Amino acid sequence: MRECISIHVGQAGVQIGNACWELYCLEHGIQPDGQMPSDKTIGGGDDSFNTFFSETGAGKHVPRAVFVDLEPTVIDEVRTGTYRQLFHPEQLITGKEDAANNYARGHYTIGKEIIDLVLDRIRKLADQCTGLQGFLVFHSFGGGTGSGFTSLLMERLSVDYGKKSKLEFSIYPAPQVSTAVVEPYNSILTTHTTLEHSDCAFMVDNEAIYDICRRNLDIERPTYTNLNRLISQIVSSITASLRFDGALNVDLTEFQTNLVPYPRIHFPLATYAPVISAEKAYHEQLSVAEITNACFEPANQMVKCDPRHGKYMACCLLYRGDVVPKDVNAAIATIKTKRSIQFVDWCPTGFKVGINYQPPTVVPGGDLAKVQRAVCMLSNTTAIAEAWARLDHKFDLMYAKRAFVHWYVGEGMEEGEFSEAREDMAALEKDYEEVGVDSV
Amino acid sequence: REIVHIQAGQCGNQIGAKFWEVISDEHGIDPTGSYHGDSDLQLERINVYYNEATGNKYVPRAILVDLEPGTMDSVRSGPFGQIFRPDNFVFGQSGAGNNWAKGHYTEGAELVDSVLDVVRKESESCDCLQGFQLTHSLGGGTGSGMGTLLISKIREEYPDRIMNTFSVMPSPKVSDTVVEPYNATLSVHQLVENTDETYCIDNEALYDICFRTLKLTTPTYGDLNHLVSATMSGVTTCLRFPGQLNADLRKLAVNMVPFPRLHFFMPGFAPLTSRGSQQYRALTVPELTQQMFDSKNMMAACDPRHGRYLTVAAIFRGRMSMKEVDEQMLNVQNKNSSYFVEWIPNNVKTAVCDIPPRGLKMSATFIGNSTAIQELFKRISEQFTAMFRRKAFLHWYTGEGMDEMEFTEAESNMNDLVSEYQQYQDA
Ligand SMILES: Nc1nc2c(ncn2[C@@H]2O[C@H](COP(=O)(O)OP(=O)(O)OP(=O)(O)O)[C@@H](O)[C@H]2O)c(=O)[nH]1
Ligand SMILES: Nc1nc2c(ncn2[C@@H]2O[C@H](COP(=O)(O)OP(=O)(O)O)[C@@H](O)[C@H]2O)c(=O)[nH]1
Ligand SMILES: O=C1NC(=O)[C@@H](c2cn3c4c(cccc24)CCC3)[C@@H]1c1c[nH]c2ccccc12
Ligand SMILES: O=C1NC(=O)[C@@H](c2cn3c4c(cccc24)CCC3)[C@@H]1c1c[nH]c2ccccc12
Ligand SMILES: [Ca+2]
Ligand SMILES: [Mg+2]
Numbered sequence: 001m002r003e004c005i006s007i008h009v010g011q012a013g014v015q016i017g018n019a020c021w022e023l024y025c026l027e028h029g030i031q032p033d034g035q036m037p038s039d040k041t042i043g044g045g046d047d048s049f050n051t052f053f054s055e056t057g058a059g060k061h062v063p064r065a066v067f068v069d070l071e072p073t074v075i076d077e078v079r080t081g082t083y084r085q086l087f088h089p090e091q092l093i094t095g096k097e098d099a100a101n102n103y104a105r106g107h108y109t110i111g112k113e114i115i116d117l118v119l120d121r122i123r124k125l126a127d128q129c130t131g132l133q134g135f136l137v138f139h140s141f142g143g144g145t146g147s148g149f150t151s152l153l154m155e156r157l158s159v160d161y162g163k164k165s166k167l168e169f170s171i172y173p174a175p176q177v178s179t180a181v182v183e184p185y186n187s188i189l190t191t192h193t194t195l196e197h198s199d200c201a202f203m204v205d206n207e208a209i210y211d212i213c214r215r216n217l218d219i220e221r222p223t224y225t226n227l228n229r230l231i232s233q234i235v236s237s238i239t240a241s242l243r244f245d246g247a248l249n250v251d252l253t254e255f256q257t258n259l260v261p262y263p264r265i266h267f268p269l270a271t272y273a274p275v276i277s278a279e280k281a282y283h284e285q286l287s288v289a290e291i292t293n294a295c296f297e298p299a300n301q302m303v304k305c306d307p308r309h310g311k312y313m314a315c316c317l318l319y320r321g322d323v324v325p326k327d328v329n330a331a332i333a334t335i336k337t338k339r340s341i342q343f344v345d346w347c348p349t350g351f352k353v354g355i356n357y358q359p360p361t362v363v364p365g366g367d368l369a370k371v372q373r374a375v376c377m378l379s380n381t382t383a384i385a386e387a388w389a390r391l392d393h394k395f396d397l398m399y400a401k402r403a404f405v406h407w408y409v410g411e412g413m414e415e416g417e418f419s420e421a422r423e424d425m426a427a428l429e430k431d432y433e434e435v436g437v438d439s440v
Numbered sequence: 441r442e443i444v445h446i447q448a449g450q451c452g453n454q455i456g457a458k459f460w461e462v463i464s465d466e467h468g469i470d471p472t473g474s475y476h477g478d479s480d481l482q483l484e485r486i487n488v489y490y491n492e493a494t495g496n497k498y499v500p501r502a503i504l505v506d507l508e509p510g511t512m513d514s515v516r517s518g519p520f521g522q523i524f525r526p527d528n529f530v531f532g533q534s535g536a537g538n539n540w541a542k543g544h545y546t547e548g549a550e551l552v553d554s555v556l557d558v559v560r561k562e563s564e565s566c567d568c569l570q571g572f573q574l575t576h577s578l579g580g581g582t583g584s585g586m587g588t589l590l591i592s593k594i595r596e597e598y599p600d601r602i603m604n605t606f607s608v609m610p611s612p613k614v615s616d617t618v619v620e621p622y623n624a625t626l627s628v629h630q631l632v633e634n635t636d637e638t639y640c641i642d643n644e645a646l647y648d649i650c651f652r653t654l655k656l657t658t659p660t661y662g663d664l665n666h667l668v669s670a671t672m673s674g675v676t677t678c679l680r681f682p683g684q685l686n687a688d689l690r691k692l693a694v695n696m697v698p699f700p701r702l703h704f705f706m707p708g709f710a711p712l713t714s715r716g717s718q719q720y721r722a723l724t725v726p727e728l729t730q731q732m733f734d735s736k737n738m739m740a741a742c743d744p745r746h747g748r749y750l751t752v753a754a755i756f757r758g759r760m761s762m763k764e765v766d767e768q769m770l771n772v773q774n775k776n777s778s779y780f781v782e783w784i785p786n787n788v789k790t791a792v793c794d795i796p797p798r799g800l801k802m803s804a805t806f807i808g809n810s811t812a813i814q815e816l817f818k819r820i821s822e823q824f825t826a827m828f829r830r831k832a833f834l835h836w837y838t839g840e841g842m843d844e845m846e847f848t849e850a851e852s853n854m855n856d857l858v859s860e861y862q863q864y865q866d867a
């Protein structure tokens with residue numbers, strides 16, 4: 001058991017979902033029609049991949065997932081795409097009108113018309129679970145749906161499923177692939193509303209991913225497809241412990257124990273390596289020490305910030321592929337005596353390590369080179385608050401003039417909600433400052 | 441006098457399964473549960489740990505407990521997995537997530553009654569139950585939380601029976617989560633009140649032995665458990681085999697524990713060996729005696745020279761001159777009489793068993809009630825305080841209904857225990 005239900009909200013959530021589930025299928029040897037020849041228990045099973053896939057009597061392995069968007073055209077591509085057989089039609093939910101880059105429309109005007117339906121379809125998945133562990137929610141901060149509808153859904157899920165764990169994969173906005181000028185507004189509103197309802201949230205800075213695609217894969221102008229294939233690899237690394245077994249396999253919930261010292265401090269910084277092109281990876285083996293050292297290069301982070309100017313409250317290393325503890329310990333010992341790694345005084349300094357022997361996988365015609373070993377570092381750093389600071393500043397510039405606020409007020413929102421949301425962010429920035437101060 | 445064995449949690453079941461694997465071989469019992477030995481010495485007191493069935497089948501009087509089926513499924517598919525009574529497998533599905541509160545108050549409370557039914561069924565079969573022995577860790581959630589819950593409820597239903605524990609202490613050198621000092625401190629609070637005898641098995645010591653002495657570059661839990669199973673076989677020898685005194689759990693407690701709360705023992709073992717690597721040269725008695733008393737051979741990371749021995753029990757195994765053992769043991773006491781309290785006359789006892797453990801022609805196991813054990817609890821207390829002063833990671837516990845006051849109380853009692861051990865170090 002220990003099933004996990006994924007929820008993909010809005011364009012970003014859906015399109016990232018496409019990349020993730022395609023990648024999952026290739027890692028588990030699942031065909032586009034859902035058949036899995038290596039799986040001998042037909043119609044069911046308690047294997048590790050069953051945490052993410054249910055099984056029909058016809059031998060089809062179906063994602064424990066719901067795709068939701070208030071506009072049909074993005075999910076319509078899933079309905080007619082390569083993996084259309086993978087999903088039951090009821091898992092793919094669409095409206096007729098998007099939220100138009102407006103949190104208010106996603107949370108209230110348009111979202112309220114479909115929220116009951118979404119919950120019913122989620123319930124149908126949950127009732128198929130013998131031991132539901134929690135939910136994984138994929139969405140953007142900037143979109144009207146990814147922002148507005150997600151926060152509504154998260155609130156409703158806390159009511160219907162109590163304290164059942166809810167994890168986030170949140171797309172942090174970037175100017176290079178921006179879709180609206182009010183994305184800072186939507187970002188602050190969602191973070192505020194969702195904060196009490198999320199147990200752990202993995203932010204993905206689009207500018208960080210944009211930079212990595214340009215720098216490491218030599219993609220002159222990355223597309224959403226370029227970004228998503230990289231993101232899915234990070235997502236895969238994090239969910240790998242849930243989808244595979246192994247002696248040195250450490251469950252994500254154990255890392256989570258170390259990563260969240262206080263309920264509001266639940267935003268880990270992800271760093272992934274190696275991101276390298278086929279041209280460069282040829283006749284070039286990146287060792288355990290090399291990819292581990294790459295985790296402390298800020299250029300490889302999922303979020304733009306400087307941990308070297310912050311303090312650590314946890315450090316987790318999630319390896320996959322040809323990796324043994326001996327080489328990990330040696331690599332860590334080297335790194336500790338050469339890097340700017342400083343912990344807060346109220347937390348132990350030991351790195352938590354997990355290893356999944358299942359080697360990394362790449363999607364056909366992709367840009368990422370296929371390597372024998374990869375690593376995803378999850379660290380709790382005060383430096384991630386820099387991401388909040390940049391967003392909150394852009395929020396302040398516009399809100400001081402109440403620019404674009406009328407689009408929200410017109411949908412029933414009040415200025416009090418804006419100020420309430422901003423104050424919560426101010427307290428959150430203060431929280432990250434406080435946890436970094438030395439004990440008395 | 442029957443003993444009921446219990447093993448709780450991942451650690452508890454893994455060292456527990458290893459314990460049964462080792463002594464079964466010593467008593468000539470195979471995985472099938474059939475005896476195939478050559479000495480009558482093996483079966484004379486085999487009733488202490490084994491039930492007998494028709495056709496002369498020997499079944500361990502053991503109860504396997506956990507809140508997740510993962511580790512117990514590995515046991516049942518392990519070498520001696522089939523020997524255990526299948527009805528004694530009592531497990532949940534939710535797990536404890538390395539959370540003492542979950543094991544003690546919520547998840548474990550839901551399963552604890554099912555366990556006690558199996559304890560009761562085993563006890564009613566006993567001609568004269570002497571007590572219980574528990575294997576568990578203190579750093580996790582199930583073995584620590586639910587384990588101490590079981591102990592409390594077992595005491596309620598069997599208040600005149602002895603409770604013994606093999607408690608694995610957490611260490612940053614071999615750590616799973618950061619909340620281990622919380623779980624450990626909460627557990628020690630329970631063990632002080634509700635056990636008569638606790639063998640302190642320190643993972644810090646086990647790691648150091650494997651790394652420094654055994655020259656194992658990167659020791660695994662399996663490497664750590666080779667030292668545990670060797671120690672456990674040793675300390676239970678006088679319970680399992682015919683000896684000069686025919687020791688039981690109560691007589692051990694009376695002789696080892698001068699004050700009720702000071703019942704936390706430092707185990708020691710010699711020679712220290714690693715898995716697979718066979719030694720060809722048997723140690724002389726003077727070597728066994730010198731090594732077993734050395735800090736490097738202590739299973740608890742405490743310097744015995746930083747304190748004084750209240751009581752000491754020792755067991756030499758193998759064919760040797762018991763006269764030579766007597767001389768050497770008397771020599772240690774006469775050479776270092778300052779590390780033995782003078783207000784407990786003749787506080788060192790030694791026994792000898794003919795049967796040696798597998799792979800060794802002779803060995804020596806050490807059980808010491810030293811005031812130096814305070815170093816262990818002080819270490820846990822410091823790690824506890826470093827987090828608790830900022831209330832770090834406390835939401836995992838308050839989320840299960842616990843209050844901050846319960847942490848403060850647990851902290852105070854362990855610090856009291858420390859000062860109590862310090863009191864007799866300067867007597
Ligand atoms: N990494 C990544 N980001 C995306 C992708 N699609 C959209 N985004 C980001 O999402 C933000 C806008 O939110 P969307 O998801 O596109 O909009 P929505 O959730 O459908 O809500 P609506 O406004 O109602 O359409 C922008 O900042 C985009 O950069 C994607 O496929 N990959
Ligand atoms: N010696 C030893 N210690 C272990 C083992 N497994 C876990 N531990 C220790 O026990 C603590 C974790 O507790 P665990 O038994 O895994 O939690 P539980 O299953 O919920 O009771 C940590 O401090 C570990 O060092 C093992 O196989 N051997
Ligand atoms: O496709 C689009 N939809 C939008 O809302 C437009 C937009 C305007 N601003 C945007 C901002 C952010 C993101 C999208 C847009 C910043 C301020 C003005 C954008 C667009 C770019 N060039 C165009 C030419 C003709 C018609 C539409 C467009
Ligand atoms: O057989 C035994 N029964 C006891 O009560 C033990 C004992 C401890 N002290 C005694 C004293 C006096 C007499 C007997 C004993 C002095 C202080 C401590 C003694 C023993 C010696 N080595 C062992 C190894 C494992 C288990 C038991 C023993
Ligand atoms: Ca199956
Ligand atoms: Mg959209």
Ligand SMILES: [Mg+2]
Pocket residue numbers: 450451580616
């Ligand atoms: Mg464990």
